[PDB]
Amino acid sequence: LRQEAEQLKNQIRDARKACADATLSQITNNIDPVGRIQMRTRRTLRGHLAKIYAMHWGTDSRLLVSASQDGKLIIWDSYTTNKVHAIPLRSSWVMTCAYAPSGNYVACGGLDNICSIYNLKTREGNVRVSRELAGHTGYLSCCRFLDDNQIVTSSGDTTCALWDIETGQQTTTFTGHTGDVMSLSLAPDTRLFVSGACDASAKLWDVREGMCRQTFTGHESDINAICFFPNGNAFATGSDDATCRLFDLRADQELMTYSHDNIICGITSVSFSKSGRLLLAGYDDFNCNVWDALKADRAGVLAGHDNRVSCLGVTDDGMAVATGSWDSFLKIWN
Amino acid sequence: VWVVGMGIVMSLIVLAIVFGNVLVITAIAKFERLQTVTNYFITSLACADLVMGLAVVPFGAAHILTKTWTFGNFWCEFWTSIDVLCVTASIETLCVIAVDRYFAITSPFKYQSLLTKNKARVIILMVWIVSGLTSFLPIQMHWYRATHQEAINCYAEETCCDFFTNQAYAIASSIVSFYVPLVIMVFVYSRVFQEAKRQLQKIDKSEGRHKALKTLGIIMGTFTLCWLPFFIVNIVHVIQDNLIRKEVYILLNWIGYVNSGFNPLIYCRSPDFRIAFQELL
Amino acid sequence: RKLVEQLKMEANIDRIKVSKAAADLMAYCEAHAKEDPLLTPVPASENPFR
Amino acid sequence: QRNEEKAQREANKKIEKQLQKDKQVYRATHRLLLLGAGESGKSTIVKQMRIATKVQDIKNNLKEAIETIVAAMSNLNQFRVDYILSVMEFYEHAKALWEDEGVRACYERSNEYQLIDCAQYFLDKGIFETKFQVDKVNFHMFDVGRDERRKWIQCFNDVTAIIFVVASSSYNMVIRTNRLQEALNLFKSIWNNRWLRTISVILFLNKQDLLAEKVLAGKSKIEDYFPEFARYTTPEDATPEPEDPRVTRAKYFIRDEFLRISTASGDGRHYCYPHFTCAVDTENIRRVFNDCRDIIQRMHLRQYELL
Numbered sequence: 001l002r003q004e005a006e007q008l009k010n011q012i013r014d015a016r017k018a019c020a021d022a023t024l025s026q027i028t029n030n031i032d033p034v035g036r037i038q039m040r041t042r043r044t045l046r047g048h049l050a051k052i053y054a055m056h057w058g059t060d061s062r063l064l065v066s067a068s069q070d071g072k073l074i075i076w077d078s079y080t081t082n083k084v085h086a087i088p089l090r091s092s093w094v095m096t097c098a099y100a101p102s103g104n105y106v107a108c109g110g111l112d113n114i115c116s117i118y119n120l121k122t123r124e125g126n127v128r129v130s131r132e133l134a135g136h137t138g139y140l141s142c143c144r145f146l147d148d149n150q151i152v153t154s155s156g157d158t159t160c161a162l163w164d165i166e167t168g169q170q171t172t173t174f175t176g177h178t179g180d181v182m183s184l185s186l187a188p189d190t191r192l193f194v195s196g197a198c199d200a201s202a203k204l205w206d207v208r209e210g211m212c213r214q215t216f217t218g219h220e221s222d223i224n225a226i227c228f229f230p231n232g233n234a235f236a237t238g239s240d241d242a243t244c245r246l247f248d249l250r251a252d253q254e255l256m257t258y259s260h261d262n263i264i265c266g267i268t269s270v271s272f273s274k275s276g277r278l279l280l281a282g283y284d285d286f287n288c289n290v291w292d293a294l295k296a297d298r299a300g301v302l303a304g305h306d307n308r309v310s311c312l313g314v315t316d317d318g319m320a321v322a323t324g325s326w327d328s329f330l331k332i333w334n
Numbered sequence: 335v336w337v338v339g340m341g342i343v344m345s346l347i348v349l350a351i352v353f354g355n356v357l358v359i360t361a362i363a364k365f366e367r368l369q370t371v372t373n374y375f376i377t378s379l380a381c382a383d384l385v386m387g388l389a390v391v392p393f394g395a396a397h398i399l400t401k402t403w404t405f406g407n408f409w410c411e412f413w414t415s416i417d418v419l420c421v422t423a424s425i426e427t428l429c430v431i432a433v434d435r436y437f438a439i440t441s442p443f444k445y446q447s448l449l450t451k452n453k454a455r456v457i458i459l460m461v462w463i464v465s466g467l468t469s470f471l472p473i474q475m476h477w478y479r480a481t482h483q484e485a486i487n488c489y490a491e492e493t494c495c496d497f498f499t500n501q502a503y504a505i506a507s508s509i510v511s512f513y514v515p516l517v518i519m520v521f522v523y524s525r526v527f528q529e530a531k532r533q534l535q536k537i538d539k540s541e542g543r544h545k546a547l548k549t550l551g552i553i554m555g556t557f558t559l560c561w562l563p564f565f566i567v568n569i570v571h572v573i574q575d576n577l578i579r580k581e582v583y584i585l586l587n588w589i590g591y592v593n594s595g596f597n598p599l600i601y602c603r604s605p606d607f608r609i610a611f612q613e614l615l
Numbered sequence: 616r617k618l619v620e621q622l623k624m625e626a627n628i629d630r631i632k633v634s635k636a637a638a639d640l641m642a643y644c645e646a647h648a649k650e651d652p653l654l655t656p657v658p659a660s661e662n663p664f665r
Numbered sequence: 666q667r668n669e670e671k672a673q674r675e676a677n678k679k680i681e682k683q684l685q686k687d688k689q690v691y692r693a694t695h696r697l698l699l700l701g702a703g704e705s706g707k708s709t710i711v712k713q714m715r716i717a718t719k720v721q722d723i724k725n726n727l728k729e730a731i732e733t734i735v736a737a738m739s740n741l742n743q744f745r746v747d748y749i750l751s752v753m754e755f756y757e758h759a760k761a762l763w764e765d766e767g768v769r770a771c772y773e774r775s776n777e778y779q780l781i782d783c784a785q786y787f788l789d790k791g792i793f794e795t796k797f798q799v800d801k802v803n804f805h806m807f808d809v810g811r812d813e814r815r816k817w818i819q820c821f822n823d824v825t826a827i828i829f830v831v832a833s834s835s836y837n838m839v840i841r842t843n844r845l846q847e848a849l850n851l852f853k854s855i856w857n858n859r860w861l862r863t864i865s866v867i868l869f870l871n872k873q874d875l876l877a878e879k880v881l882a883g884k885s886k887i888e889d890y891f892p893e894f895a896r897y898t899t900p901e902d903a904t905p906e907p908e909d910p911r912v913t914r915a916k917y918f919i920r921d922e923f924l925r926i927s928t929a930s931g932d933g934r935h936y937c938y939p940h941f942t943c944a945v946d947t948e949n950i951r952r953v954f955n956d957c958r959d960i961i962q963r964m965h966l967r968q969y970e971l972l
């Protein structure tokens with residue numbers, strides 16, 4: 001019965017231990033440190049009603065989109081501080097947002113167990129629902145756009161799924177995870193993606209196969225975010241406890257642990273830099289830290305908000321990083 | 335030698351008032367979180383206190399120490415006008431803060447809709463404009479100046495100038511500055527304390543297992559002990575000119591001035607203001 | 616049952632040495648280090664924000 | 666190129682003009698989160714506050730209750746039970762069911778299996794948002810429910826108060842901890858939450874008439890399930906109605922059991938508003954308004970250092 005599963009898990013752990021040859025810090029001890037990094041708010045973006053959870057930089061690096069409980073998802077032009085579109089939300093709650101690579105559609109998901117996709121670019125400048133996605137038992141944790149037609153969603157029913165908007169049905173469903181999934185990230189190659197959940201386990205799924213190829217369970221508490229290394233062969237997660245970890249997909253185990261004695265709060269969002277050197281992680285202690293990926297040290301402190309930060313995003317151009325907090329003050333930091 | 339100590343004390347008081355007002359204004363302006371509808375009144379109060387402490391307190395100290403007003407008569411006119419304007423603005427700002435607290439406490443649901451940033455700016459502009467109309471307008475037009483022969487010479491003389499006013503202007507100016515606001519805030523804080531006592535009684539009854547009195551007592555007693563003696567002697571000297579002496583008038587005027595210095599301590603004890611203060615320094 | 620099948624499927628997968636993965640990661644980071652406005656100070660004129 | 670800048674400025678102006686009214690509307694209304702437990706009767710309170718195909722839904726609920734009774738019998742007319750067990754005409758078959766003595770005992774022995782109370786009485790014979798206005802004040806209530814993790818609770822940091830609906834008559838139930846003590850634990854978890862640092866609770870104790878009905882009968886002893894009640898005595902202060910002293914003592918013990926953790930854990934900005942709500946009491950709408958007014962007033966007293 002369960003004895004075979006326990007033996008297989010022990011064998012997997014032994015294989016992961018045997019795969020370990022040298023620690024990442026031992027290899028990176030020779031490299032020069034990044035040094036002190038000072039960042040300041042080049043542009044502050046205000047005018048939003050309530051606390052926000054979500055943000056997704058556009059591929060053009062110009063348009064930025066955020067969502068709050070106010071019942072409105074509003075697109076912000078980063079350069080000129082102009083609210084290009086203000087889309088009211090049918091459901092008062094949104095726990096995620098997404099921006100299409102083409103930029104034609106904008107996705108929003110909330111606690112109403114239904115994800116909605118808005119047609120941002122229309123004739124006569126009217127924003128309307130294109131399709132509303134079918135029920136996933138529970139709040140839609142996170143939503144991303146593989147293309148203009150397909151959206152991969154996560155929700156509280158412990159299941160992730162990729163949907164075709166034209167049909168409006170579940171093309172494939174990823175099941176088999178114990179806890180509620182809370183975050184996900186898609187690889188730059190878009191063939192693979194991982195999902196961060198509340199069951200203290202982060203596992204990679206294959207889009208075409210529909211089966212979890214690998215499973216990582218290094219963390220002890222529930223994890224709240226996950227982002228890919230720009231190379232696409234590694235990804236890092238932020239957890240409820242102060243620790244954040246970086247996992248190597250080929251090494252199948254946890255490479256480096258990011259933690260400090262002083263920090264005891266939770267981590268809300270994790271985003272990599274364009275080069276991947278700086279792992280930008282938000283915190284529940286009302287600030288965020290720009291931590292070095294390799295040396296595993298604090299490159300610099302970064303505090304601008306009264307409330308806890310709730311979302312981060314590094315633009316594809318890499319020019320600067322934006323952060324969103326519960327004070328409704330979404331500030332873009334370079 | 336007694337003059338040197340008094341001058342040092344006056345300089346220290348002016349510096350303390352200026353520093354407190356500047357710190358309050360900087361804390362209000364720098365942090366976006368501290369900026370709230372009820373804190374625009376605090377910003378106006380801080381601006382008025384800073385203006386008063388920077389303008390009239392050093393000039394008054396110079397006048398009392400030197401015993402001769404070296405500047406021109408028009409400059410002394412402007413000094414008296416700006417002094418009375420700042421005093422009225424400060425007291426009326428305390429009254430407006432009391433009214434805001436009354437609306438916040440007595441009718442909790444009406445407060446959110448009634449008080450707005452535009453509404454706060456409108457009421458602050460209205461109170462500053464009414465202070466101007468009540469204080470600055472009669473000073474320049476020369477209505478207030480004493481009709482009796484006494485001090486007409488010193489009003490004509492440029493060397494020295496002392497406040498000698500007609501009995502008509504003194505009553506109305508003192509009324510609008512202090513007495514109407516005194517009644518308003520007394521009634522407001524009586525109602526607020528009654529609501530606090532009712533809430534304490536209800537929470538004691540429900541749980542089954544005062545602090546507001548001390549705070550209200552501070553907020554009332556500081557203002558009363560600072561200002562009421564000066565305005566009562568303002569009322570009484572025009573009635574009986576032989577009743578008081580000039581030194582008493584000056585001492586009570588400066589003890590009234592000191593309220594602006596004390597006030598940042600009284601009205602900026604909120605945790606957000608403490609956080610802003612420790613962040614700035 | 617299903618967990619047994621999933622763990623059996625994920626049990627037999629090839630593993631690369633951790634040293635090789637670390638070397639590849641640091642090589643990528645060093646190679647693409649120059650083209651990163653966060654890592655090196657952004658030129659004032661080239662910076663769109665200011 | 667300045668035309669694009671002018672167009673963007675005009676669009677921003679229009680968006681801000683709409684957003685001003687949106688913010689006014691948002692600040693006008695108050696948010697209440699209803700954390701009513703399963704089978705706690707939160708539907709009755711919502712219906713009371715608010716105040717065919719629905720008949721088909723009620724018939725389906727009655728069929729589900731009959732299936733639950735059959736399962737309870739398994740956990741312990743024969744063809745009719747098989748039809749219904751097989752079901753998993755029919756009306757007549759259902760009427761044949763519950764006629765036997767065993768099914769009547771299973772209805773009496775509800776401790777083993779959870780059954781719908783509203784359907785059971787008639788049997789013998791998805792987020793929900795509600796907008797209700799009281800005294801020209803915009804109240805707008807929500808229902809979030811069933812996850813053990815309860816991650817959505819941390820989302821509700823802007824609501825004025827959390828209505829925690831629980832049935833005091835649920836002490837007799839047994840599941841693997843009775844639902845009353847499970848609700849006590851859930852209330853403690855809500856109270857001892859880091860994110861809910863400025864949130865009050867307005868709880869209602871439904872089924873108080875049914876609570877009296879259970880208390881009058883000696884079938885289940887309070888001390889058998891809650892030993893501390895035996896040493897517990899009625900507090901000196903009381904709010905007697907017309908009720909026997911034993912019922913009042915039991916109700917006050919339940920209220921104190923809820924109130925103990927709430928009073929001990931937090932002081933200031935964390936207050937509890939116990940209301941004894943009857944099944945058919947229609948004054949609960951006014952009680953919620955009074956409690957919300959008191960909560961906002963006490964928050965303002967806690968601010969300004971008055972306390």
Ligand SMILES: CN[C@@H]1CCc2c(ccc(O)c2O)[C@H]1O
Pocket residue numbers: 417418421422497504507508511587
């Ligand atoms: C001598 N200094 C002035 C004289 C008159 C005066 C003061 C303050 C408030 C008023 O309403 C006044 O009318 C004093 O500060």
